[PDB]
Symmetry: C3
Subunit: 398 residues, 3 copies
């Protein structure tokens, strides 16, 4: 086989092979035969997430405890908020440029505090065994700091055993990085199969008003990359073209998997092999995979308008900053799983005063939901790109 | 900030600030705003339990396998049974002294609804990873000992490759164990806020209900819990030559945590660090302390003795002029059966009631039992603190014998 | 105490003490008193499975990555398929020799109820290795343990020696745990005599006092087929490969007896792996082939199902197709692979081979005869499981000597 631009060869062919097959009613032919090969690829990547996230972040607390972590924390969080606040606003502009909703809608027919407290796991083993990335992040930092403190103990028996544990954890972290290299050998077949399904199932439904909303989303996602990331990398001195060259693997994976969390092992390997320290990326990237959802903010901003246009609400000629605010909250609230943005979109809809209980909102929401995997691909790719852009920026600041 | 007597400054202030706010109907205000801070403290301690308990016991199986473990096991178990058997008897006396139940258990209508061998067999885990991932302190204890013993045997093998790789594993386990202790030092900095907020809740909620006959039962419990410490612990430590006043000085942190948390199990990280930092060997404390967090419930045994009487007095049963040793026996059984979670003693009280012959099906027993349950957290605090103190006392005594 | 033939002293005594007690209506006396001591034994062995399987296979990827694992894999899989294909055919021959089903399956009324294949192959790759470990799940663990071990070997040859040190550290700790579990199975086998005694004591005093008449005919059919699987297949196949069959039994005694009395192929795994270790097989071979065999290679199940399909077909008077009973041969292989290392699943997986011959559990006379077999299932499971485990060791030994 040639280079690993065979992902592109599988992507273009898979889009064509898919899109054609689904038009001829063979949606279930692709699902029953091609999709399992795409699922295996996701299966392999999900596997690596839990070890790689924990193990790299424990070794991630090699760097200065007060600063770095403290500084990099505030830095990355401030970055994350501002990018998501910009992302929805850009989606609003796209939903005022394109006007997705002339026709009358088809046919008819969490305690917050108890979320913050849930960042602290009550069983680190239980958290590890149950996915649960955010609680793992917390424990891994707390452990990693403790180990560093133990290594400066006057007692050299504690210093030995603390260094021992840290190595064994590092060995495991380093092992998962060697595996993501290997799992990327299957990627072209996995990529091929994954867009093959989405095109041959939801792609043959991107017609009419649904094409208008998808056009509004994707051009907003393109303008997110160019107007925000490409600009923001340029101001920070980091070459935007060398950035995409290095981030190509994680972007394509994020686009195809639609799982920000599932793309994490290949995102962290990209950050490793672009010369960022485990001190920065072991913290920023998993956090970004749960908290920074830029393409979701844009997706929600342009979808709140879709429904409000499809019902004929004026969308408050003034107070659509309620969307902007709430879409940031929804972005953070959104999971790194490959569907949650459409589910979380419900929260920004009740913010604008149109609940899914009114059967005509539900009618238009069900119409958006039919092409969600199409919208998810580009949205997720931007979600991951936002994470890497933020990491690269903050890693240069430090 | 001053010293870590800011726990006391946070305890007194919290009990006052709570007590007042709850009297003025702001029980839900405290619950929505103050309680989460006390919950964070609990979250943080719960976090450390599983790793600290497993890892320290594996390293704790450094001591002599046949003895220590063997000898220490029998010693602590014999100790645990006797303290508990005393604790109930002391609670019976307190319930004959104070007479909690002159009035007829008023309203009626608000009712409530283990195979023993399939309990012993459950000490052996079928999946140690599963055990660790699922709480389950007891099966973990079992496995951690078996592993730690296997490691010691492995290090004395003629094959030095097996010796090197075993010694490696033991260190990494110790590294983790040691790391968790460093963390409990950190999480204790939050303790004052955590304490403040936790009594702020209980006082502002069930405290403003400790009135009348419920005050009489509370008095009887607490004076019993006081008399457990002085008559049993302070005496038993004194006879074993360990200084009782130097004992409390060291146990201050664990005792206060246990009281405020009400989780015997959740207080374990701070109890074990108190055992470490009073110079007991991991060989002893890594075994006796988590075991005592599940098997040794002294303050529960007392609570159950005095509450069996409250109910029997509220219904006017004679509480068998003679055979209330059935309580004494069954309360020990209930104590052992009780969990280190912060409610179970009230739940387990049901077992000693059916022993005396008054089930929760009779809706007048159920009426009295529901009244006790209304001030349970108030009773749970003192009860849990005494629960944990018994663990340390036992460890100190047994450690000194060995 | 004497030697570790105290297992036999406990087995013989337990079979007798049981068989007597269950005849005198004390089935529940044995269950409530003797069975917990047998259960403790099982409990203890189950405990070691997950750590020993994971850790030994990670260290097991010490051997050559492309070959060994690749070669041993194809070899053992090919071995497994051919032994299972022969096993059912042998059971067919036993079910034609003995004729289990002359009387009409009397009593009607005790009915039972009526996996997506691709969504099984994909499940071999775990989405959370910790979850996998914490949930039993031997097969996803096998996949991850290999991938991890191979990654470590690659990491130790890296030009960066910080990555080489930390990787060697991890490998050692894992080996430390692997080795620890082996020392433990040495100990848990001291309890085995009491465990064995109590376990057959139950089965004999409960299902043994029911092995009478037609059910004794079907039991006789099974056990003579299991014996001929040992003598005609294993004893022969070891002899062709040069490995001494009598020295093989001498060493495999501990794993065989355990497997027999436990009926859990998976639960016998620590004692099967320690037998393979102390007969001098490399962890590269046995740490891969034995846990795979305890999930894929069910030879005694294949035989059990072949002879049980015939039992129900004879009981209903179906001619069992004078020609196409290779449908059973094929499907019993698939049912063997499908069968779990749990101590009862072979009777449950027998339902699949019955629908392959066209006689479902919905028909109230099939469900009557199936429930009759089910009543003596543990008697059949003992010999079946022991042969299941024997097949794993035989293959491991043959494939190890090939490599
Ligand atoms: C919306 C609060 C913003 C504060 C950011 C701190 C991280 C909290 C956000 C986590 C939300 C994830 C949703 C829970 C999914 C699990 O379960
Ligand atoms: C009653 C037996 C006393 C002998 C001491 C052996 C310790 C085993 C007792 C376990 C009882 C704990 C109750 C179940 C807890 C869980 O659930
Ligand atoms: C049936 C396909 C044969 C190919 C062999 C590959 C091994 C996969 C077979 C797994 C079947 C075991 C049943 C799953 C038990 C659990 O759950
Ligand atoms: N697929 C997105 C979530 C979403 O669809 O909003 C992600 O994981 O980033
Ligand atoms: N919460 C107490 C048990 C009880 O309430 O009886 C403890 O764990 O010590
Ligand atoms: N108990 C058997 C399975 C079966 O009953 O077929 C085994 O694991 O080997």
């Amino acid at each position: 086989y040639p280079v690993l631009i065979k992902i592109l060869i599988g992507l273009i062919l898979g889009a064509i092979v898919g899109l054609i097959l689904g038009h001829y009613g063979y949606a279930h032919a692709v699902h029953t035969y091609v999709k399992p090969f795409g699922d295996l690829f996701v299966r392999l990547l999900k596997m690596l997430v839990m070890p790689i996230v924990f193990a790299s972040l424990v070794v991630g607390a090699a760097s200065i405890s007060p600063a770095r972590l403290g500084r990099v924390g505030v830095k990355i969080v401030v970055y994350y908020l501002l990018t998501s606040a910009f992302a929805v606003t850009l989606g609003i502009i796209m939903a005022r440029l394109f006007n997705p909703g002339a026709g009358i809608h088809l046919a008819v027919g969490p305690p917050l505090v108890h979320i913050l407290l849930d960042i602290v796991p009550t069983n680190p083993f239980g958290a590890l065994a149950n996915g649960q990335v955010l609680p793992t992040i917390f424990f891994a930092i707390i452990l990693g700091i403790a180990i560093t403190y133990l290594m400066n103990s006057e007692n050299e028996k504690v210093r030995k055993s603390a260094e021992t544990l840290l190595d064994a954890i590092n060995g495991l972290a380093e092992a998962m990085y060697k595996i993501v290299n290997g799992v990327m050998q299957y990627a072209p077949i996995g990529v091929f199969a994954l867009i093959a399904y989405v095109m041959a199932e939801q792609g043959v439904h991107v017609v009419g008003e649904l094409a208008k909303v998808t056009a509004a989303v994707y051009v907003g996602l393109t303008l997110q990359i160019l107007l925000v990331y490409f600009v923001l990398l340029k101001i920070y001195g980091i070459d935007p073209i060398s950035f995409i060259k290095h981030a190509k693997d994680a972007m394509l994976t994020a686009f195809v998997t639609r799982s920000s969390s599932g793309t994490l092992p290949v995102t962290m390997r990209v950050a490793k092999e672009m010369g960022i320290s485990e001190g920065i990326y072991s913290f920023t990237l998993p956090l970004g995979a749960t908290i920074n959802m830029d393409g979701t903010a844009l997706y929600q901003g342009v979808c709140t308008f879709f429904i409000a246009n499809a019902l004929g609400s004026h969308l408050t000629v003034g107070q659509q900053l309620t969307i902007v605010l709430t879409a940031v909250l929804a972005s953070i609230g959104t999971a790194g799983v490959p569907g949650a943005g459409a589910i979380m979109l419900a929260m920004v809809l009740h913010s604008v005063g149109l609940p899914l209980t009114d059967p005509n909102v539900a009618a238009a929401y069900a119409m958006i939901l039919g092409i969600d995997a199409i919208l998810d691909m580009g949205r997720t790719m931007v979600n991951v790109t936002g994470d890497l852009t933020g990491t690269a920026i903050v890693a240069k600041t430090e």
